[PDB]
Amino acid sequence: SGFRKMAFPSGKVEGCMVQVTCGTTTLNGLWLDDVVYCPRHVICTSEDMLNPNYEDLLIRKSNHNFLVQAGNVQLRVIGHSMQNCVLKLKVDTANPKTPKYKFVRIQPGQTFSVLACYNGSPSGVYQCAMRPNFTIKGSFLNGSCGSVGFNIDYDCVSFCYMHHMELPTGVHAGTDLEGNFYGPFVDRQTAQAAGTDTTITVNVLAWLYAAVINGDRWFLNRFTTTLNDFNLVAMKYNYEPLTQDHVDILGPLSAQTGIAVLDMCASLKELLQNGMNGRTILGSALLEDEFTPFDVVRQCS
Amino acid sequence: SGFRKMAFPSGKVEGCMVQVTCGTTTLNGLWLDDVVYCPRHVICTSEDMLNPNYEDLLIRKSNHNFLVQAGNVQLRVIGHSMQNCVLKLKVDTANPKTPKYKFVRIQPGQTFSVLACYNGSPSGVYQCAMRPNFTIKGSFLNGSCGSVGFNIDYDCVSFCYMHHMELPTGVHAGTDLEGNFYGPFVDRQTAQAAGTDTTITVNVLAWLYAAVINGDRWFLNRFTTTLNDFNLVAMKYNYEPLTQDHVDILGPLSAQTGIAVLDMCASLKELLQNGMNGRTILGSALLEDEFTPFDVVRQCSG
Ligand SMILES: Nc1cccc([N+](=O)[O-])c1C(=O)N[C@@H]1C[C@H]1c1ccc(Cl)c(F)c1
Ligand SMILES: Nc1cccc([N+](=O)[O-])c1C(=O)N[C@@H]1C[C@H]1c1ccc(Cl)c(F)c1
Ligand code: NA
């Protein structure tokens, strides 16, 4: 037993991290087969960043303007192109450590591991969720741009996030590996602010089911709720609406514990109303919303 | 910005995890050069586990009784011996992925990364502290025995923990890689319990410094304290005593934030006395004690 925010083992991703330099800017790139993926803003000066014309900046670059360093070795850039907000640098060597992989674009509520890196060198691994407002609450310093988020279900790495910037409130914004931003964000210095954030209700319920599985029942009550009534109350505490999809997804945890979904919803309503009264749930004094139904099944069963 | 429970990248350790089977028991082993390290209890049945004579059980085993699988390949065991509570299986192949490493024993309060594994296959990585009571609050199912804890200190992996068992309260117990248990535990089925635990005061203060660095400042006040006065407070709340050594270690964070350690202790005193009054610190409604001063500096400056 126990319940921990657990990340995927990072080794398959570590062997793909490289350093990309352009001019005086250095950041991280992801080296898969013979392509290095990194944020296109590597081509900008900070002046450029207010209103950058990336097509104009990029046409002025040659291959040899891009320095790619994989551990100790320089790779030769033999092509470049831009796809959305990512630069794809074609290199002369396929990465021999390329894992089985895919690119997947995730939805708010989904969790993933982040391998934080500086100068193409991995620093640490931690677990994150895509927030309803399409940001992530990461831990990133200057130089972390191009660090990636991923899941590994089986031996296949699913890359879902590449880090581009920190917003003024200290949360983080980035793209999928096709270079499409999550959220309304752009790789420009403008007034862009994260929408107010909400709690990921389906994940809190999942975690309540994890608490029950692990022997913890104090927060249950004799009540049920309709879905609509649950949503009317939940929204008053800045919780995301729960949809029939979410109810469906929680079906297996429901069957395992013998607690119907809307019965667990009634428990959540009461917790929001009463707080915890000096108690903890799975060691937390707050309701945790960064474990998905899938993650609870993975870690608990 | 931001502050997360962060593990070391696990790649160097993943390439050393193997599956060890003996009879019906399968668990995880650590393959370094030509030795596989795993819990000696792999040799026991359930009955044996009540009152095991390890030396007697072991002498009855041949090399071929140990099936070691590294991914798809069987390794051939060519020798076996015991050091304390760990079994050392000599194999015919050196691990080509052996990192630079050392075996180090950690002190209570120190943190490390755990790579959780099942059937020699790594499944997750998380960050733990060695509790004052010598347990760890891990996350482990059956099959996890032989999973390892480590720090990385350059390109050098320092292995500090190997998982042996879960205690009745759902916390975990294990050994260093020389097979010495952390805490007063034994590898047999008897009644064993975690002792009462305490909060790691130096780590809480570290985390308060992390909060300040990240712009969370509401708990700072104009007051200061002395070590002795604070220590009277710590004792009352089941916090570890703070020593001059602790104060010394927090020196760098003190200089960077302009909050002296005993200044921050005055903050912590007030938190323990008055609670958080509806507020959070780095997203938490409890005081976090599983980041060391070094961890905060490493994450907040490196
Ligand atoms: N300077 C930082 C400090 C701490 C942490 C981070 N971070 O998590 O990346 C940064 C940061 O935002 N770095 C980016 C180069 C900066 C940039 C600035 C604006 C736009 Cl639109 C962009 F795409 C890129
Ligand atoms: N029962 C469990 C349930 C869930 C997770 C775990 N776990 O964390 O490993 C266990 C557990 O303790 N497994 C050990 C083989 C069992 C054993 C039993 C007793 C003694 Cl003293 C020993 F060294 C070993
Ligand atoms: Na003070």
XYZ file of C-alpha atoms and ligand atoms in Angstrom:
652
model
C 0.000 0.000 0.000
C 0.824 3.699 0.239
C -0.126 6.242 -2.389
C 2.420 8.457 -4.064
C 2.553 10.896 -6.948
C 4.656 8.585 -9.110
C 6.329 9.423 -12.414
C 7.181 7.004 -15.231
C 10.813 5.756 -15.285
C 12.580 8.453 -17.320
C 15.424 6.442 -18.946
C 13.731 6.116 -22.396
C 13.391 9.922 -22.530
C 16.806 10.686 -21.012
C 18.496 8.987 -23.981
C 16.744 11.457 -26.350
C 17.651 14.775 -24.659
C 20.097 17.051 -26.486
C 21.227 20.681 -26.310
C 20.250 23.090 -29.108
C 22.054 26.410 -29.564
C 21.289 29.249 -31.907
C 23.239 32.477 -31.504
C 23.495 33.088 -27.750
C 20.335 31.064 -26.909
C 20.702 27.519 -25.591
C 17.771 25.193 -24.751
C 16.801 21.501 -24.875
C 15.809 19.408 -27.894
C 14.276 15.943 -28.273
C 16.240 13.640 -30.586
C 14.119 10.893 -32.113
C 15.461 8.929 -35.099
C 17.094 11.579 -37.277
C 15.050 14.634 -36.109
C 15.620 17.052 -33.218
C 12.424 18.798 -31.990
C 12.689 22.034 -30.024
C 10.719 25.308 -29.415
C 10.903 27.621 -32.419
C 11.630 30.554 -30.076
C 15.238 29.333 -29.963
C 15.668 31.501 -33.118
C 14.523 34.716 -31.351
C 16.345 37.443 -29.496
C 14.393 38.835 -26.540
C 13.573 41.987 -28.614
C 12.100 39.695 -31.317
C 9.754 38.251 -28.700
C 7.163 41.089 -28.636
C 6.135 40.548 -32.274
C 8.383 37.816 -33.828
C 7.954 36.933 -37.482
C 9.193 33.369 -37.289
C 9.065 32.741 -41.042
C 11.278 35.834 -41.567
C 13.689 34.911 -38.767
C 13.931 31.313 -39.993
C 14.558 32.029 -43.715
C 17.741 33.891 -42.651
C 19.162 30.776 -40.941
C 21.265 28.013 -42.446
C 21.744 24.458 -41.084
C 25.171 25.324 -39.650
C 23.593 28.159 -37.579
C 22.106 25.372 -35.394
C 24.495 23.597 -32.982
C 23.122 20.326 -31.596
C 25.103 18.553 -28.857
C 24.219 15.009 -27.731
C 26.239 14.369 -24.594
C 29.808 14.960 -25.828
C 29.158 14.677 -29.590
C 28.131 17.399 -32.051
C 25.434 16.257 -34.461
C 25.387 17.750 -37.952
C 22.170 19.585 -38.891
C 21.329 18.726 -42.532
C 17.844 20.276 -42.739
C 15.361 22.420 -40.818
C 11.681 23.193 -40.941
C 9.029 24.712 -38.742
C 5.797 22.936 -37.852
C 3.457 25.197 -35.921
C 5.520 26.335 -32.888
C 8.228 23.657 -33.055
C 11.471 23.634 -35.021
C 12.388 20.267 -36.570
C 16.133 19.960 -37.220
C 17.150 17.071 -39.501
C 20.430 15.580 -38.272
C 22.974 13.247 -39.890
C 22.687 10.455 -37.250
C 19.581 8.530 -36.181
C 19.432 8.368 -32.375
C 20.479 4.736 -31.569
C 18.558 5.038 -28.274
C 15.271 6.026 -29.961
C 12.525 4.172 -27.999
C 9.255 2.975 -29.455
C 7.255 6.211 -29.375
C 4.256 8.243 -30.521
C 3.064 11.850 -30.321
C -0.296 12.272 -28.543
C -2.167 15.510 -27.785
C -3.761 15.302 -24.343
C -6.949 16.763 -22.785
C -7.212 18.825 -19.524
C -7.215 16.476 -16.546
C -4.690 14.052 -18.125
C -1.430 13.484 -16.173
C 2.095 12.926 -17.476
C 5.719 12.818 -16.308
C 8.005 15.765 -16.897
C 11.737 15.254 -17.356
C 13.188 18.655 -16.424
C 16.448 19.385 -18.341
C 19.077 22.155 -18.672
C 21.691 22.264 -21.420
C 20.380 18.955 -22.806
C 21.159 17.368 -19.416
C 18.268 15.816 -17.375
C 17.858 17.216 -13.898
C 14.755 15.596 -12.418
C 11.448 13.848 -13.042
C 8.048 14.709 -11.603
C 4.357 14.100 -12.236
C 2.028 16.884 -13.616
C -1.556 17.288 -14.888
C -2.851 19.444 -17.756
C -4.952 21.992 -15.778
C -8.492 22.908 -16.997
C -6.985 26.297 -17.994
C -4.417 24.470 -20.219
C -1.427 25.312 -18.053
C 0.717 22.974 -15.981
C 1.965 23.601 -12.441
C 5.548 22.630 -13.134
C 8.958 23.312 -11.685
C 11.145 25.008 -14.283
C 14.026 27.501 -14.259
C 15.489 29.511 -17.129
C 16.977 27.084 -19.675
C 14.281 24.429 -19.148
C 12.541 25.230 -22.489
C 12.263 22.109 -24.674
C 11.894 19.760 -21.645
C 9.173 17.198 -22.410
C 6.185 15.520 -20.810
C 5.361 11.896 -21.511
C 3.543 8.731 -20.530
C 4.906 5.211 -20.996
C 2.089 2.708 -21.277
C 4.027 -0.523 -21.993
C 7.351 0.025 -23.771
C 5.895 2.841 -25.913
C 6.662 6.443 -24.936
C 3.803 8.861 -25.667
C 5.218 12.395 -25.893
C 2.447 14.850 -25.068
C 4.122 18.084 -23.967
C 7.088 20.314 -24.802
C 7.824 23.228 -22.474
C 7.920 26.740 -24.000
C 7.453 29.369 -21.264
C 6.489 30.418 -17.764
C 3.459 32.717 -17.416
C 3.423 35.686 -14.924
C 1.525 33.711 -12.242
C 4.382 31.172 -12.162
C 2.598 28.350 -14.061
C 3.766 26.876 -17.370
C 2.653 26.732 -21.019
C 3.808 24.597 -23.944
C 2.811 22.608 -27.006
C 2.179 19.074 -28.164
C 5.014 17.577 -30.210
C 3.342 18.821 -33.409
C 3.959 22.326 -32.037
C 0.303 23.231 -31.305
C -0.030 25.101 -28.009
C -2.255 23.820 -25.265
C -4.649 26.610 -24.390
C -4.972 30.086 -25.958
C -1.206 30.696 -25.539
C 1.246 31.983 -28.160
C 5.046 32.080 -28.290
C 5.066 35.867 -28.139
C 5.514 38.226 -25.161
C 1.959 39.579 -24.962
C -0.639 40.044 -22.241
C -1.744 36.462 -21.969
C -2.996 35.229 -18.659
C -4.203 31.803 -17.636
C -7.962 31.571 -17.201
C -8.971 31.066 -13.582
C -8.180 27.511 -12.683
C -10.660 24.892 -11.500
C -10.304 21.572 -9.691
C -10.392 18.421 -11.845
C -13.473 16.787 -10.332
C -13.154 13.421 -12.086
C -9.597 13.073 -10.700
C -10.649 13.981 -7.123
C -13.323 11.254 -7.312
C -10.745 8.796 -8.641
C -8.496 9.611 -5.660
C -11.442 9.208 -3.229
C -11.916 5.721 -4.752
C -8.160 5.119 -4.187
C -8.630 6.076 -0.504
C -11.467 3.529 -0.166
C -9.408 0.825 -1.935
C -6.588 1.521 0.541
C -8.863 1.072 3.571
C -10.190 4.611 4.245
C -13.987 5.178 4.570
C -14.441 8.053 7.060
C -15.728 10.565 4.422
C -18.519 8.408 2.991
C -22.145 9.263 3.877
C -25.600 7.723 3.443
C -26.586 10.140 0.666
C -26.704 10.138 -3.107
C -27.116 13.018 -5.567
C -28.335 13.556 -9.096
C -25.589 14.498 -11.562
C -27.148 17.953 -12.160
C -27.399 18.757 -8.428
C -23.804 17.614 -7.912
C -22.699 19.963 -10.756
C -24.674 22.921 -9.346
C -22.915 22.553 -5.982
C -19.491 21.660 -7.425
C -19.328 24.759 -9.637
C -19.796 26.930 -6.545
C -16.385 25.668 -5.314
C -14.673 26.159 -8.687
C -14.815 22.445 -9.535
C -15.002 21.384 -13.164
C -18.385 20.001 -14.320
C -18.610 16.233 -14.184
C -19.998 14.783 -17.416
C -21.595 11.428 -18.221
C -18.240 10.521 -19.787
C -16.573 11.050 -16.430
C -19.252 8.908 -14.732
C -18.649 6.151 -17.322
C -14.853 6.315 -16.814
C -15.287 5.828 -13.031
C -17.424 2.691 -13.626
C -14.553 0.192 -12.872
C -13.547 1.924 -9.599
C -17.253 1.916 -8.716
C -17.478 -1.865 -9.279
C -14.312 -2.576 -7.288
C -15.369 -0.647 -4.170
C -19.147 -1.211 -4.334
C -19.743 2.566 -4.141
C -21.868 4.010 -6.954
C -20.451 7.084 -8.715
C -23.214 9.496 -7.592
C -22.831 8.115 -4.053
C -19.140 9.112 -4.195
C -20.300 12.470 -5.619
C -22.460 12.923 -2.497
C -19.341 12.250 -0.362
C -17.402 14.909 -2.326
C -20.248 17.428 -1.833
C -20.053 16.886 1.953
C -16.245 17.205 1.997
C -16.484 20.539 0.161
C -19.062 21.694 2.690
C -17.331 20.449 5.898
C -13.627 20.323 5.045
C -11.600 17.530 6.649
C -11.929 18.466 10.362
C -8.270 17.699 11.173
C -8.307 14.416 9.212
C -6.269 13.471 6.160
C -7.112 11.332 3.135
C -4.183 9.282 1.795
C -1.901 11.605 3.799
C -3.323 14.838 2.315
C -5.171 17.678 4.098
C -6.412 18.889 0.655
C -8.400 17.066 -2.040
C -5.890 15.811 -4.656
C -6.841 16.266 -8.320
C -3.655 15.147 -10.144
C -4.395 11.388 -10.289
C -6.605 10.145 -13.111
C -8.962 7.118 -13.030
C -6.297 5.322 -15.138
C -3.498 6.295 -12.705
C -5.448 5.040 -9.675
C -6.031 1.671 -11.341
C -2.301 1.547 -12.340
C -0.996 2.292 -8.829
C -3.724 0.629 -6.706
C -5.824 -2.073 -8.344
C 9.250 28.988 -10.639
C 7.277 26.175 -9.101
C 8.198 23.534 -6.565
C 7.604 19.822 -7.018
C 8.503 16.570 -5.285
C 11.160 15.699 -7.814
C 13.041 12.418 -8.275
C 16.463 11.958 -9.886
C 16.255 10.719 -13.531
C 16.029 6.917 -13.143
C 17.689 5.791 -16.421
C 21.046 4.719 -14.882
C 19.190 2.491 -12.382
C 16.629 1.122 -14.866
C 19.449 -0.542 -16.828
C 20.419 -2.507 -13.678
C 17.012 -4.001 -12.740
C 16.536 -7.773 -13.205
C 14.027 -10.430 -12.131
C 15.166 -13.066 -9.627
C 13.148 -16.258 -9.122
C 13.689 -18.951 -6.558
C 11.052 -21.664 -6.322
C 7.701 -19.878 -6.446
C 9.066 -16.468 -5.311
C 9.790 -13.824 -7.941
C 11.219 -10.417 -6.954
C 13.609 -7.740 -8.245
C 17.407 -7.731 -8.213
C 20.056 -5.082 -8.892
C 22.633 -6.176 -11.484
C 25.935 -4.355 -11.145
C 28.964 -5.723 -12.995
C 28.809 -9.470 -12.471
C 26.723 -9.522 -9.241
C 22.941 -9.471 -8.724
C 21.867 -8.087 -5.318
C 18.456 -8.955 -3.908
C 16.712 -9.547 -0.509
C 17.852 -12.825 1.061
C 14.199 -13.641 1.804
C 13.844 -14.710 -1.843
C 15.022 -18.143 -0.627
C 12.130 -18.571 1.865
C 8.687 -20.144 1.550
C 5.847 -18.792 3.769
C 6.563 -21.453 6.427
C 10.321 -20.765 6.333
C 9.519 -17.071 6.842
C 8.148 -17.676 10.371
C 11.547 -18.852 11.662
C 14.177 -18.856 8.827
C 17.729 -20.121 9.244
C 19.137 -18.324 6.215
C 22.509 -20.057 6.168
C 20.791 -23.467 6.336
C 18.219 -22.652 3.652
C 20.962 -21.224 1.407
C 23.401 -24.154 1.641
C 20.658 -26.401 0.185
C 20.387 -24.272 -2.981
C 22.337 -24.730 -6.179
C 23.257 -21.928 -8.607
C 20.701 -23.251 -11.136
C 17.954 -22.831 -8.480
C 18.274 -19.074 -9.075
C 16.681 -17.938 -12.345
C 17.804 -14.407 -13.205
C 16.179 -12.657 -16.166
C 17.538 -9.404 -17.623
C 14.814 -8.278 -20.026
C 14.609 -11.227 -22.440
C 17.918 -12.922 -21.540
C 18.585 -15.509 -18.820
C 21.793 -14.867 -16.895
C 23.658 -17.884 -15.540
C 24.273 -17.812 -11.771
C 27.814 -19.098 -11.051
C 27.968 -18.366 -7.300
C 25.856 -17.268 -4.339
C 26.636 -15.793 -0.937
C 25.037 -13.625 1.688
C 26.033 -10.303 3.212
C 23.757 -9.496 6.126
C 20.232 -9.421 4.713
C 21.148 -9.318 1.024
C 21.857 -12.241 -1.293
C 24.719 -11.755 -3.790
C 24.357 -13.883 -6.923
C 27.505 -14.078 -9.059
C 26.513 -14.219 -12.737
C 28.469 -15.114 -15.890
C 27.944 -11.712 -17.608
C 28.975 -8.256 -16.384
C 26.126 -5.758 -16.825
C 27.228 -3.589 -19.830
C 24.935 -0.825 -18.492
C 26.592 -0.740 -15.048
C 26.803 2.988 -14.075
C 29.501 4.513 -11.926
C 28.150 3.831 -8.450
C 28.679 3.524 -4.726
C 26.793 1.930 -1.829
C 26.033 4.563 0.837
C 24.001 4.319 4.030
C 21.745 7.330 4.544
C 20.727 9.135 7.757
C 17.086 9.663 8.885
C 15.837 12.940 7.372
C 17.762 12.381 4.102
C 15.753 11.929 0.874
C 16.245 9.574 -2.090
C 14.511 8.427 -5.293
C 12.841 5.018 -5.406
C 12.425 3.120 -8.662
C 9.464 0.803 -8.000
C 9.701 -2.472 -9.969
C 7.673 -5.669 -10.556
C 9.144 -8.776 -12.210
C 12.435 -6.894 -12.761
C 10.467 -4.311 -14.767
C 10.575 -0.651 -13.535
C 7.103 0.779 -13.213
C 7.461 4.127 -11.420
C 9.831 6.572 -9.741
C 9.071 8.703 -6.696
C 10.876 10.695 -4.017
C 10.993 9.500 -0.349
C 12.643 10.503 2.924
C 14.072 8.103 5.494
C 11.711 8.814 8.443
C 13.134 9.445 11.996
C 11.576 6.034 12.790
C 13.586 4.416 9.941
C 10.582 3.638 7.770
C 9.689 5.099 4.392
C 6.218 6.127 3.250
C 6.430 4.342 -0.072
C 3.964 2.921 -2.570
C 4.515 -0.795 -3.036
C 2.417 -3.839 -3.958
C 3.416 -7.504 -3.708
C 6.272 -8.160 -6.137
C 8.020 -4.864 -5.279
C 10.683 -6.424 -2.965
C 14.207 -5.646 -4.175
C 13.190 -2.229 -5.616
C 15.961 0.286 -4.862
C 16.474 3.838 -3.631
C 19.284 6.100 -4.812
C 20.688 9.604 -5.175
C 22.804 10.865 -8.079
C 25.782 13.039 -7.082
C 27.421 13.661 -10.514
C 27.427 10.748 -12.957
C 27.720 8.579 -9.809
C 24.659 6.694 -8.526
C 24.646 6.304 -4.739
C 22.467 3.302 -3.895
C 21.120 3.679 -0.372
C 18.007 1.498 -0.070
C 16.617 -1.909 -1.058
C 12.978 -2.714 -0.304
C 12.286 -5.778 1.928
C 8.783 -5.519 3.434
C 5.626 -3.605 4.280
C 4.714 -3.043 7.948
C 1.092 -3.366 9.264
C 0.446 0.416 9.180
C 1.220 0.363 5.425
C 4.727 1.938 5.627
C 7.898 0.248 4.353
C 11.185 -1.188 5.682
C 14.392 -2.231 3.960
C 18.160 -2.344 4.037
C 21.154 -0.522 2.659
C 22.903 -2.340 -0.182
C 25.222 -4.018 2.328
C 22.083 -5.666 3.723
C 21.917 -3.748 7.053
C 18.308 -2.834 7.923
C 17.316 0.727 8.522
C 15.513 0.612 11.845
C 14.904 -2.239 14.358
C 13.355 -4.624 11.789
C 14.111 -8.256 10.866
C 13.372 -10.246 7.718
C 10.992 -12.731 9.300
C 7.239 -12.950 9.871
C 6.924 -11.746 13.453
C 4.899 -8.930 14.999
C 6.736 -5.755 13.976
C 5.487 -2.152 14.020
C 6.653 1.326 13.020
C 7.624 3.282 16.127
C 6.059 6.702 16.649
C 7.420 9.074 14.032
C 8.472 12.737 14.312
C 8.621 15.637 11.855
C 11.975 16.504 10.274
C 12.354 20.110 11.462
C 15.372 21.038 9.345
C 13.463 19.863 6.231
C 10.315 21.848 7.117
C 12.455 25.010 7.431
C 14.094 24.177 4.074
C 10.634 23.942 2.469
C 9.637 27.271 4.098
C 12.720 28.790 2.383
C 11.524 27.215 -0.912
C 8.113 28.867 -0.335
C 9.746 32.291 0.191
C 11.917 31.847 -2.939
C 8.700 31.099 -4.885
C 6.915 34.246 -3.613
C 4.877 32.702 -0.758
C 5.643 35.019 2.168
C 2.501 35.367 4.303
C 3.998 33.402 7.264
C 7.059 35.632 7.694
C 6.947 37.885 10.795
C 9.203 40.441 12.507
C 10.204 38.071 15.324
C 13.257 35.935 16.046
C 13.993 33.211 18.592
C 16.837 31.235 20.182
C 17.667 27.557 19.544
C 16.680 26.510 23.098
C 13.317 28.298 23.064
C 12.521 26.916 19.615
C 13.592 23.400 20.723
C 11.139 23.581 23.626
C 8.451 24.283 20.990
C 9.670 21.535 18.615
C 9.550 18.936 21.393
C 5.981 19.858 22.220
C 4.833 19.247 18.625
C 6.763 16.021 17.985
C 9.335 17.789 15.836
C 12.957 16.675 15.822
C 15.306 18.993 17.805
C 17.112 21.561 15.655
C 20.879 21.567 16.186
C 23.575 24.107 15.358
C 24.536 21.773 12.510
C 21.028 22.197 11.070
C 21.366 25.980 11.370
C 24.748 25.815 9.578
C 23.288 23.696 6.728
C 20.475 26.261 6.180
C 23.062 29.099 6.068
C 22.917 29.487 2.212
C 19.102 29.719 2.086
C 19.305 32.222 4.953
C 21.725 34.468 3.034
C 19.718 34.304 -0.204
C 16.346 35.223 1.322
C 17.536 37.536 4.126
C 15.618 35.471 6.688
C 17.923 34.172 9.441
C 17.287 30.564 10.511
C 15.978 31.575 13.975
C 13.849 34.203 12.183
C 12.321 31.378 10.104
C 12.030 29.318 13.326
C 9.892 32.150 14.739
C 7.618 31.701 11.671
C 7.511 27.917 12.210
C 6.751 28.430 15.938
C 3.705 30.530 14.989
C 2.528 27.999 12.389
C 2.728 25.170 14.936
C 0.944 27.268 17.563
C -1.776 28.903 15.414
C -2.063 26.692 12.314
C -2.313 28.083 8.773
C -5.663 29.927 9.239
C -7.170 28.727 5.946
C -4.008 29.459 3.934
C -1.642 27.133 2.047
C 2.124 27.158 1.453
C 3.343 25.931 -1.960
C -0.137 24.473 -2.454
C -0.059 22.445 0.801
C -2.243 22.716 3.958
C 0.392 20.750 5.924
C 4.055 21.486 6.597
C 6.140 19.359 4.193
C 9.201 17.654 5.678
C 10.475 15.530 2.751
C 12.744 18.106 1.088
C 16.256 18.572 2.430
C 18.137 21.906 2.359
C 20.201 20.420 -0.495
C 17.021 19.431 -2.391
C 15.654 22.966 -2.160
C 18.920 24.554 -3.314
C 19.230 21.971 -6.130
C 15.675 22.553 -7.445
C 15.451 26.319 -6.767
C 18.867 27.346 -8.172
C 20.081 24.551 -10.495
N 12.598 33.119 -18.076
C 12.074 32.054 -17.392
C 12.262 31.933 -15.998
C 11.844 30.800 -15.312
C 11.250 29.750 -15.996
C 11.044 29.867 -17.360
N 10.481 28.706 -18.047
O 9.820 27.907 -17.408
O 10.700 28.581 -19.248
C 11.386 31.014 -18.087
C 10.880 31.282 -19.483
O 9.705 31.627 -19.682
N 11.783 31.144 -20.476
C 11.453 31.386 -21.877
C 12.510 31.865 -22.821
C 11.409 32.797 -22.397
C 10.248 33.185 -23.292
C 9.575 34.383 -23.082
C 8.374 34.646 -23.717
C 7.838 33.712 -24.590
Cl 6.339 34.007 -25.397
C 8.523 32.539 -24.819
F 7.962 31.602 -25.621
C 9.725 32.273 -24.206
N 2.440 -8.175 2.222
C 2.719 -7.160 1.347
C 1.657 -6.480 0.719
C 1.883 -5.413 -0.133
C 3.174 -4.986 -0.378
C 4.231 -5.638 0.239
N 5.548 -5.035 0.053
O 5.658 -3.830 0.230
O 6.483 -5.760 -0.259
C 4.066 -6.745 1.088
C 5.234 -7.502 1.686
O 5.692 -7.218 2.799
N 5.737 -8.497 0.931
C 6.915 -9.258 1.332
C 7.311 -10.569 0.729
C 6.664 -10.534 2.087
C 7.405 -10.673 3.403
C 6.713 -11.019 4.556
C 7.313 -10.941 5.801
C 8.628 -10.517 5.905
Cl 9.346 -10.238 7.459
C 9.332 -10.226 4.755
F 10.619 -9.818 4.857
C 8.746 -10.308 3.510
Na 10.478 36.077 11.934
